[PDB]
Subunit: 106 residues, 3 copies
């Protein structure tokens, strides 16, 4: 099992998740870490996860704003997660296109 | 089973859900569709659903802001939903009285 | 079983939960009541509840803003709640340090 670190805010100051796209395998963890230009958060819309389960998208969403440097949030995409793409965004920086995509391999 | 379309924002530009009040039967779906003056969202307070279940109100709430024209969200009020009134509102337009009510018939 | 009333906003106008720290026993209820300077809400971060369960923190969080005088929200810390500290904050007044802590006794 691997852990993928996603920086929220690039080192240079770009309002992006870095890296934006990550492919994971069942059991892998994605760890988001507050990097530059907080606050950020991590939203998955109900229609943006495989099978469009609102329960799933809600449980994955960290809608609470993250302010502190190095503040982190992790999701383990375990065996019961459906394969497909999970597209997320940062609410504060939606206008800037601060978005990402986790692919659970099938 | 029927699907009731609720417009978020009237065609004229009134900040309302149209229609604001809908009566549904078990198995029916309510589909909210982004119509005018986005963003909107759909919040049910824990005390505003029958039996005051916070778990139920949370699961029905689409708190994520909806920005795009025609963006939609649906809830199927299935057999296990308690009869009674489910009162919701739009956070951005709470001040304008952008509110609605779904009645599940008993 | 006891109910602990926590005022959101002190009578004087301080932006605090009063009292900020409460110790509860299994079966006890905490009732938050809108007191001064609304809106307030009540957020528990996933890492701020015992065992860091995001499901638990989400279910305890009343993220919807509370505007009306006397508007209340209750949580019963029942037998299945893990012992330890549950640290929460108000989003609008995070900058002012409007924070609290519920201790479930073990
Ligand atoms: Cu951001
Ligand atoms: Cu609205
Ligand atoms: Cu407050
Ligand atoms: Zn892997
Ligand atoms: Zn949605
Ligand atoms: Zn019907
Ligand atoms: Zn409430
Ligand atoms: Zn007690
Ligand atoms: Zn968190």
């Amino acid at each position: 099992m691997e852990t993928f670190t996603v920086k929220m805010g690039a080192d240079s100051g770009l309002l992006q998740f870095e890296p934006a796209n990550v492919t994971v395998h069942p059991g892998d963890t994605v760890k988001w870490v507050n990097n530059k230009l907080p606050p950020h958060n991590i939203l998955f819309d109900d229609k943006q996860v495989p099978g469009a389960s609102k329960e799933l998208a809600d449980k994955l969403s960290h809608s609470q704003l993250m302010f502190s440097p190095g503040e982190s949030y992790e999701i383990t995409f375990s065996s019961d997660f459906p394969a497909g793409t999970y597209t997320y965004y940062c609410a504060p920086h939606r206008g800037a296109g601060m978005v990402g995509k986790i692919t659970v391999e099938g």
